[PDB]
Design a protein around this ligand. Structure first.
Ligand SMILES: [Mg+2]
Ligand SMILES: [Mg+2]
Ligand SMILES: [Mg+2]
Ligand SMILES: [Mg+2]
Ligand SMILES: [Mg+2]
Ligand SMILES: [Mg+2]
Ligand SMILES: [Mg+2]
Ligand SMILES: [Mg+2]
Ligand SMILES: [Mg+2]
Ligand SMILES: [Mg+2]
Ligand SMILES: [Mg+2]
Ligand SMILES: [Mg+2]
Ligand SMILES: [Mg+2]
Ligand SMILES: [Mg+2]
Ligand SMILES: [Mg+2]
Ligand SMILES: [Mg+2]
Ligand SMILES: [Mg+2]
Ligand SMILES: [Mg+2]
Ligand SMILES: [Mg+2]
Ligand SMILES: [Mg+2]
Ligand SMILES: [Mg+2]
Ligand SMILES: [Mg+2]
Ligand SMILES: [Mg+2]
Ligand SMILES: [Mg+2]
Ligand SMILES: [Mg+2]
Ligand SMILES: [Mg+2]
Ligand SMILES: [Mg+2]
Ligand SMILES: [Mg+2]
Ligand SMILES: [Mg+2]
Ligand SMILES: [Mg+2]
Ligand SMILES: [Mg+2]
Ligand SMILES: [Mg+2]
Ligand SMILES: [Mg+2]
Ligand SMILES: [Mg+2]
Ligand SMILES: [Mg+2]
Ligand SMILES: [Mg+2]
Ligand SMILES: [Mg+2]
Ligand SMILES: [Mg+2]
Ligand SMILES: [Mg+2]
Ligand SMILES: [Mg+2]
Ligand SMILES: [Mg+2]
Ligand SMILES: [Mg+2]
Ligand SMILES: [Mg+2]
Ligand SMILES: [Mg+2]
Ligand SMILES: [Mg+2]
Ligand SMILES: [Mg+2]
Ligand SMILES: [Mg+2]
Ligand SMILES: [Mg+2]
Ligand SMILES: [Mg+2]
Ligand SMILES: [Mg+2]
Ligand SMILES: [Mg+2]
Ligand SMILES: [Mg+2]
Ligand SMILES: [Mg+2]
Ligand SMILES: [Mg+2]
Ligand SMILES: [Mg+2]
Ligand SMILES: [Mg+2]
Ligand SMILES: [Mg+2]
Ligand SMILES: [Mg+2]
Ligand SMILES: [Mg+2]
Ligand SMILES: [Mg+2]
Ligand SMILES: [Mg+2]
Ligand SMILES: [Mg+2]
Ligand SMILES: [Mg+2]
Ligand SMILES: [Mg+2]
Ligand SMILES: [Mg+2]
Ligand SMILES: [Mg+2]
Ligand SMILES: [Mg+2]
Ligand SMILES: [Mg+2]
Ligand SMILES: [Mg+2]
Ligand SMILES: [Mg+2]
Ligand SMILES: [Mg+2]
Ligand SMILES: [Mg+2]
Ligand SMILES: [Mg+2]
Ligand SMILES: [Mg+2]
Ligand SMILES: [Mg+2]
Ligand SMILES: [Mg+2]
Ligand SMILES: [Mg+2]
Ligand SMILES: [Mg+2]
Ligand SMILES: [Mg+2]
Lengths: 361, 345
């Protein structure tokens, strides 16, 4: 309705803000959201998926994967494991792999040039070390005059019972803008933050764990490398959900008095807006009902006989067009529920909530 | 701003930023998915906790906070304390089983990533099941639902990549839906293919006679037990329901609805009827020997339609006795003072 009764009340872009979050996913930082964009949290401002995504998972997600098998697979490896690669880290082989972002790095897979300091993946492949303590002897002929395999015998990501369970592919060099700890200790002020030397590990696993200002914790049982990304519980929501929240947390009286001041004192502009914004807050607050109801989570269903299903001629049935719309809603909503339970990749949830929204319209 | 585009852009965007590497990336996540399962199981084993419970708690800590448990499936599980306590015993698991915990989580996460990267796959498929009767958005969504199903049974031990695998699972979910929701009236799948068959048959039958084939042709052409009565019945179900609200006659304000009459409602005359019938019948019910008059009056007009089982304790001979002597004494003094004669029906 031209004066969006909800946009008027909730001082949000009267006509554009809503449209943006309501039907799509242009989140509005509902409560807190510590971490910055360059400025403090947007208490009631909106952001885009890109900037949003660039908040939760850390400042950068780069996955420059090298070509060939030796070239770039050697420049990075020598400076990826533990070696805190600074901004603009110039890897040196194909072209110039540009690690233009923060803290530490984690390389993915290796081919078959030289194996050293890696994980226990190939450990089983070449018995000697997994079988006995021969990894030291692994060093061919120089040993007579943690990992350090032979000069070069293996090739791809496999299980060596027999060369059956294999996987011959690339070598990703994904830079993860996150701070890596390996030997965190215990200080009992607050609840044990992080981890211990090697034994005790109180941290939640590789997913969502809140320590200090940094808020995500991945785990690598290789070295005691407790990966701690930094963003926090930035309450980000879109669609009627977000708005429902906002409308409930509102002491109309306050905004009634606030506007009272805003109305009479400042110049025409903002005070004019305030008057048109006071009318509704007044109506509601008056004999009127309480405004948390503009939200719909429970759709009444119009009577049956009023939306007949009748027999016409032979096999021809005739019904109110309303019934089709109802199924539209019913199905989506059902698909929704299934979709949340069965697991839920963001894209698909929203994409449906969108449809669901349109359906309700 | 007109849906379609936005969501297309939406995942084509995340796909465009993260497609899955033909092998490496696909195999990777996969291996992490299965071990998650193996983990949750072994967890369930060591904790005596339900795998469904192990699966939901790990999901929480990875996918969302109390927000996702509370609003979706109602608060059966304590938004905080419950899931927390659960996560606790997970920590208590020593260096051995703890390992699985960390595995379950990471696997679950791996799962998601696999799903995201293969959304375009759905779109391409679903893009061909367009004109079936479902919204393209609905078609992809269901197809998507199928993709996830595919993520439940894929065995990476069996070399063949996910691509071909999801194809089937999706298409299955798609067709299912198509036959399930695309109608104002649910009809079993069997009857669906049947109609197709008939339809297809009519086409070939529309190929030479130059006559829209009589229900004889169709019965013949289709096969075994096909008959005129059959075909006529099928096509009558095929036809989609028309709008109770439709332009009528000389296309004006006239709406189809006002044209359909009523039958339940007793139009005034029937109301009048019920009055006299009830009043008069009640006047005759009071002038009668209760026993076998009320038995049949109640057995016939009060419950359902059993001579022996009609009278309480007195057997059939006393039933037939008063039933046929009272009903006749009843019918004839009513023959005298003619009140019911004029068939109220
Ligand atoms: Mg309006
Ligand atoms: Mg505003
Ligand atoms: Mg910046
Ligand atoms: Mg900035
Ligand atoms: Mg706010
Ligand atoms: Mg992260
Ligand atoms: Mg940042
Ligand atoms: Mg160079
Ligand atoms: Mg840094
Ligand atoms: Mg490699
Ligand atoms: Mg090597
Ligand atoms: Mg090593
Ligand atoms: Mg051994
Ligand atoms: Mg020697
Ligand atoms: Mg020596
Ligand atoms: Mg020496
Ligand atoms: Mg020496
Ligand atoms: Mg091998
Ligand atoms: Mg093996
Ligand atoms: Mg081989
Ligand atoms: Mg094998
Ligand atoms: Mg190959
Ligand atoms: Mg102390
Ligand atoms: Mg240690
Ligand atoms: Mg511990
Ligand atoms: Mg302790
Ligand atoms: Mg921290
Ligand atoms: Mg910390
Ligand atoms: Mg309060
Ligand atoms: Mg406020
Ligand atoms: Mg106050
Ligand atoms: Mg004030
Ligand atoms: Mg409301
Ligand atoms: Mg509302
Ligand atoms: Mg009916
Ligand atoms: Mg009916
Ligand atoms: Mg007609
Ligand atoms: Mg109507
Ligand atoms: Mg899943
Ligand atoms: Mg996602
Ligand atoms: Mg989409
Ligand atoms: Mg979207
Ligand atoms: Mg692109
Ligand atoms: Mg088992
Ligand atoms: Mg037990
Ligand atoms: Mg809630
Ligand atoms: Mg639930
Ligand atoms: Mg307990
Ligand atoms: Mg204990
Ligand atoms: Mg999973
Ligand atoms: Mg279509
Ligand atoms: Mg197998
Ligand atoms: Mg197969
Ligand atoms: Mg099914
Ligand atoms: Mg055929
Ligand atoms: Mg054709
Ligand atoms: Mg025919
Ligand atoms: Mg038919
Ligand atoms: Mg007319
Ligand atoms: Mg008209
Ligand atoms: Mg009408
Ligand atoms: Mg009609
Ligand atoms: Mg009318
Ligand atoms: Mg009727
Ligand atoms: Mg009449
Ligand atoms: Mg009468
Ligand atoms: Mg008697
Ligand atoms: Mg008697
Ligand atoms: Mg009877
Ligand atoms: Mg009967
Ligand atoms: Mg009987
Ligand atoms: Mg009896
Ligand atoms: Mg009896
Ligand atoms: Mg009885
Ligand atoms: Mg007796
Ligand atoms: Mg007689
Ligand atoms: Mg007599
Ligand atoms: Mg008579
Ligand atoms: Mg008399």
């Amino acid at each position: 309705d031209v004066p969006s009764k909800i946009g008027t009340l909730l001082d949000l872009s009267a006509t554009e803000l809503e449209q943006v979050l309501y039907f799509s996913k242009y989140i509005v930082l509902d409560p807190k959201g510590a971490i910055l964009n360059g400025v403090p949290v947007e208490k009631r401002q909106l952001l885009t998926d890109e900037e949003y995504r660039e908040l939760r998972y850390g400042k950068q997600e780069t996955y420059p994967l090298p070509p060939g098998v030796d070239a770039l697979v050697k420049d990075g490896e020598e400076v990826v494991k533990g070696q805190e690669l600074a901004p603009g880290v110039v890897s040196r082989l194909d072209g110039v792999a540009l690690y233009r972002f923060p803290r530490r790095v984690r390389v993915e897979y290796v081919k078959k040039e030289r194996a050293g300091l890696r994980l226990p993946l190939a450990a089983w492949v070449e018995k000697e070390a997994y079988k006995p303590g021969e990894i030291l002897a692994e060093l061919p002929e120089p040993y007579l005059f943690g990992d350090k395999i032979v000069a070069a015998i293996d090739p791809e990501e496999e299980v060596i019972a027999e060369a059956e369970g294999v996987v011959h592919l690339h070598e990703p060099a994904s830079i993860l803008v996150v701070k890596a700890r390996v030997y965190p200790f215990e200080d009992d002020v607050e609840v044990s933050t992080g981890d211990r030397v090697a034994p005790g590990d109180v941290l939640a696993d590789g997913g969502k764990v809140k320590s200090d200002v940094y808020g995500r914790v991945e785990v690598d049982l290789v070295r005691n490398v407790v990966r701690v990304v930094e963003s926090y519980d930035i309450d980000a929501r879109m669609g009627a959900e977000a708005i429902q929240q906002l409308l409930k947390e509102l002491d109309l009286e306050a905004l009634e008095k606030e506007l009272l001041e805003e109305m009479k004192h400042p110049s025409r502009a903002r005070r004019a807006k305030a008057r048109k914004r006071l009318e509704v807050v007044r109506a509601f607050l008056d004999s009127g009902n309480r405004p948390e109801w503009m939200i719909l989570e429970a759709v009444p269903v119009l009577p049956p006989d009023l939306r007949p299903m009748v027999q016409v001629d032979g096999g021809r049935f005739a019904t109110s067009d309303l019934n089709d719309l109802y199924r539209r809603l019913i199905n989506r909503n059902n698909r929704l529920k299934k979709l949340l339970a069965q697991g839920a990749p963001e894209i698909i949830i929203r994409n449906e909530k969108r449809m669901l929204q349109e359906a309700v319209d | 701003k007109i849906s379609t585009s936005d969501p297309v852009r939406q995942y084509l965007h995340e796909i465009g930023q993260v497609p899955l590497l033909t092998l490496e990336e696909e195999v990777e996540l996969a291996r992490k998915v299965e071990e998650g399962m193996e983990a949750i199981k072994k967890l369930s084993e060591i904790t005596g906790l339900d795998p469904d419970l192990i699966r939901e708690v790990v999901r929480a800590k990875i996918l969302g906070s109390a927000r996702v448990r509370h609003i979706p499936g109602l608060k059966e599980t304590l938004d905080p304390k419950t899931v927390e306590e659960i996560d606790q015993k997970l920590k208590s698991l020593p260096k051995e089983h703890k390992r699985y915990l960390h595995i379950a989580r990471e696997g679950e996460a791996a799962r998601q990533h696999l799903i995201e990267a293969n959304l375009r796959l759905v779109v391409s498929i679903a893009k061909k099941y367009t004109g079936r009767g479902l919204s393209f958005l609905d078609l992809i969504q269901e197809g998507n639902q199928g993709l996830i199903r595919a993520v439940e049974k894929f065995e990476y031990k069996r070399r063949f990549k996910f691509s071909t695998y999801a194809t089937w699972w999706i298409r299955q979910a798609i067709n299912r839906a198509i036959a399930d929701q695309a109608r104002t009236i649910r009809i079993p799948v069997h009857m669906v293919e049947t109609i197709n068959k008939l339809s297809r048959t009519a086409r070939q039958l529309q190929q030479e006679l130059g006559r829209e084939p009589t229900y004889e042709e169709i019965a013949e052409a289709m096969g075994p037990g096909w008959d005129a009565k059959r075909v006529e019945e099928t096509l009558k179900i095929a036809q989609e329901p028309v709008s109770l609200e439709t332009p009528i006659g000389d296309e004006k304000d006239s709406f189809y609805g006002d044209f359909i009459p009523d039958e339940h409602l007793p139009s005034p005359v029937d109301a009048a009827t019920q009055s006299l019938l009830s009043e008069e019948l009640e006047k005759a019910l009071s002038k009668l020997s209760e026993r076998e008059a009320m038995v049949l009056k109640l057995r016939k007009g009060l419950i359902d339609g059993e001579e022996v089982g009609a009278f309480f304790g007195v057997t059939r001979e006393r039933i037939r006795q008063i039933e046929n002597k009272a009903l006749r004494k009843l019918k004839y003094h009513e023959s005298r003072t003619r009140k019911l004669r004029d068939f109220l029906d």
